[PDB]
Amino acid sequence: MIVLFVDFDYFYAQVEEVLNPSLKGKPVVVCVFSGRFEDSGAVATANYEARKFGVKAGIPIVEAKKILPNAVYLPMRKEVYQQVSSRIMNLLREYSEKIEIASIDEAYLDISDKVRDYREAYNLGLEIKNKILEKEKITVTVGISKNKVFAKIAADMAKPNGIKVIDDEEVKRLIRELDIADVPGIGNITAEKLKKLGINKLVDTLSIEFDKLKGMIGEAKAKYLISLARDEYNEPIRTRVRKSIGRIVTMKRNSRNLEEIKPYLFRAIEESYYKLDKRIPKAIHVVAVTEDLDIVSRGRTFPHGISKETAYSESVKLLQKILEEDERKIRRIGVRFSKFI
DNA sequence: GGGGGAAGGACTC
DNA sequence: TCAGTAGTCCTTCCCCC
Ligand SMILES: Cc1cn([C@H]2C[C@H](O)[C@@H](COP(=O)(O)OP(=O)(O)OP(=O)(O)O)O2)c(=O)[nH]c1=O
Ligand SMILES: [Ca+2]
Ligand SMILES: [Ca+2]
Ligand SMILES: [Ca+2]
Ligand SMILES: [Mg+2]
């Protein structure tokens, strides 16, 4: 199997730069303003100019402004990024039927039936980068290897605006020299647990007692890491089918007053249904983000599709369940639909 | 024992 | 004073042949 992974460079910010060339060269920060107070919210992403001084995804907008008060701050316009993204994904389908869109700015192409070796794979990669640049003037990074995981690792190493191939030999090398925290799917929580086991490289997972590893990071993650260590990971590239559609919004102020939360909850339901398009969900979850930012969720699965009317009444039941089972104040409220017919 | 599922939370991105 | 809201897994409790 030969896999080619594509990840668009500093996507949200780059799109803004394509739509407004004068931004090129200046630090640009795409922001998610929450409305609670002046500059309240988080950074969605920033271009490399801004990222260079510590302004990156996730940090508070207020903090970004302390670091680069003169950077250009733009409100996130996800709809616009989504449409640009959709066009680029369509350019990708031309290179392979087997494509897995993993997020708004990345996808995997199984080009096994398209090239014969990495040399050709590399060229196809350059071809794809030129194509996207020509059509949308967007730079992306390509990663190529024997499976999805290493194709992604390949791209992470070559970004931004790059291209890299990790041949069979380098895969074996990485299984020994690569920091395990840099393996896709390993976050801070898991990385830390692994360090507490003396595990810092994929190969190390092979010298520990399975159940000990398992008992520490879960059966799935343990098996995942082990299969990679054994150079046995080979998950197929498959069409992604969205499994849930929802909306969660921050309220002007925290509260646990039903009548005061409802409007938001109902707004969330309205937007979610629009997104559902023609999909009919059999499950609904009311999601609350408490004042301390903990997440409390209560849902229900019905034997038949949920009409928007049922969604209204049922969501109110779930919200109250949360209210009676959690005394904290609610900061954000939303709904999430799944199990589509 | 294990197929099968619903529900709430953990972890990742 | 930290947005948003998807996709696995894991746990528990639980029905049932
Ligand atoms: C990470 C992260 C990304 N995003 C959005 C912003 C990004 O443009 C997009 C893709 O995430 P990356 O993870 O691919 O963000 P980036 O495109 O700016 O990437 P790079 O370092 O590869 O050049 O999704 C968030 O909104 N919040 C986040 O916490
Ligand atoms: Ca990405
Ligand atoms: Ca990217
Ligand atoms: Ca990591
Ligand atoms: Mg909690």
Q: What is the DSSP secondary structure assignment for residue A203, as one 8-state letter?
A: G
What is the SS3 assignment for A133? helix
Distance CA A97, CA A28 (A): 35
Place of tokens 């490399």: A48
Distance CA A150, CA A162 (A): 15
What is the SS3 assignment for A144? strand
Are residues A153 and A174 in contact, defined by beta-carbon separation less than 8 angstroms?
A: yes
Domain identity same for A102 and A70: no
Q: Which two tokens stand for residue A299?
A: 């849902």
Q: Which of A177, A333, A191, A186 minimizes the C-alpha distance to A267?
A: A333
Q: Which of A45, A56, A59 to mutate to test the pocket of ligand 1 (most atoms within 8 A of CB)?
A: A45
Is omega for the bond preceding A160 within 30 degrees of 0, making it cis? yes
Q: Which atom of ligand 1 is nearest to the CA of A106?
A: 14
Of A123, A143, A166, the one marking the end of a domain is A166
In a domain, A320, yes or no: yes
| A48 Cα–ligand 1 center, Å | 12
Of A148, A166, A184, the one marking the end of a domain is A166
Asked if A101 CB < 7 A from strand B, the reply is no
Residue nearest to nucleotide B7 (CA to C1'): A299
Instruction: Give the domain CATH number at A269.
Output: 3.30.1490.100
Cβ within 8 Å of residue A11, ≥6 positions away? A45, A81, A85, A104, A105
Cβ within 8 Å of residue A69, ≥6 positions away? none
Domain identity same for A155 and A172: no
Q: Which two tokens stand for residue A97?
A: 């039927």
Q: Which two tokens stand for residue A34?
A: 């929450």
Across all strands, nucleotide nearest A183 (CA–C1'): B12
Helix axes A210-217, A219-229, angle to 10 degrees: 130
In a domain, A6, yes or no: yes
Domain identity same for A114 and A206: no
Distance CA A266, CA A338 (A): 17
Segments forming the whole domain that contains residue A195: 167-233
Spatial distance from the CA of A249 to the C1' of C17 (Å): 46
Domain identity same for A73 and A201: no
Domain identity same for A159 and A60: no
Q: Say if strands A295-301 and A3-8 run parallel, antiparallel, or are unpaired.
A: unpaired
Are residues A297 and A326 in contact, defined by beta-carbon separation less than 8 angstroms?
A: no
Cβ within 8 Å of residue A243, ≥6 positions away? A338, A340
Are residues A251 and A264 in contact, defined by beta-carbon separation less than 8 angstroms?
A: yes
Q: Say if strands A163-165 and A140-145 run parallel, antiparallel, or are unpaired.
A: parallel
Are residues A175 and A231 in contact, defined by beta-carbon separation less than 8 angstroms?
A: yes
Report which protein residue has its CA nearest ligand 1's atom 15: A10
Distance CA A269, CA A316 (A): 11
| A195 Cα–ligand 2 center, Å | 26
Strand arrangement, sheet containing A295-301: A244-255, A330-340, A281-290, A295-301
Burial class of residue A67, CB neighbours in 10 A (0-12, 13-18, 19+): middle
What is the SS3 assignment for A151? helix
Contacts by A228-235 with C-beta closer than 8 Å and gap 24+? A228/A149, A228/A175, A228/A183, A228/A202, A229/A175, A229/A202, A229/A203, A229/A204, A229/A205, A230/A206, A231/A171, A231/A172, A231/A175, A233/A147, A233/A148, A233/A149, A234/A1, A234/A146, A234/A147, A235/A147, A235/A148
Distance CA A86, CA A78 (A): 12
Ligand nearest to C-alpha A328: 5
Helix axes A118-136, A78-93, angle to 10 degrees: 140
Surrounding residues of ion ligand 5, Cβ less than 5 A = A 294
Spatial distance from the CA of A272 to the C1' of C12 (Å): 30
Q: Which amino acid is at A207?
A: S
Are residues A140 and A7 in contact, defined by beta-carbon separation less than 8 angstroms?
A: yes
Ligand nearest to C-alpha A288: 5
Q: Which amino acid is at A51?
A: R
| A286 Cα–ligand 1 center, Å | 27
Q: Which amino acid is at A274?
A: Y
Distance CA A268, CA A335 (A): 6
Report which protein residue has its CA nearest ligand 1's atom 17: A10
Q: How was this structure determined?
A: X-ray
* Alpha helices in chain A, H assignment, sequence order: 11-19, 48-51, 61-67, 78-93, 118-136, 148-158, 168-177, 188-195, 210-217, 219-229, 258-276, 308-325
Spatial distance from the CA of A149 to the C1' of C6 (Å): 19
Spatial distance from the CA of A225 to the C1' of B12 (Å): 15
Are residues A70 and A93 in contact, defined by beta-carbon separation less than 8 angstroms?
A: no
In a domain, A239, yes or no: no
List pocket residues of ligand 1, CB cut-off 6 Å.
A 7-12, 44-45, 57-58, 104-105, 159-160
Q: Which of A181, A22, A8, A196 minimizes the C-alpha distance to A85?
A: A8
Domain identity same for A113 and A6: yes
In a domain, A122, yes or no: yes
Q: Say if strands A330-340 and A244-255 run parallel, antiparallel, or are unpaired.
A: antiparallel
Q: Which of A9, A11, A84, A141 to mutate to test the pocket of ligand 1 (most atoms within 8 A of CB)?
A: A11
Q: How far is CA A19 from CA A13, A60, A92, A138, A323, in A?
A: 10, 25, 22, 11, 44
Over A6-66, what HEC string results? EEECCHHHHHHHHHCHHHCCCCEEEEEECCCCCCCEEEEEECHHHHCCCCCCCCEHHHHHH
Instruction: Quote the number of domains for chain A.
Output: 4
Phi-psi region of A160 (alpha: psi -120 to 50; beta: other; left: phi over 0): beta
Asked if A196 CB < 7 A from strand B, the reply is no
Q: Which two tokens stand for residue A167?
A: 């041949």
Q: What is the DSSP secondary structure assignment for residue A237, as one 8-state letter?
A: P
In a domain, A26, yes or no: yes
Domain identity same for A254 and A219: no
- Determine whether A106 is an active site residue: yes
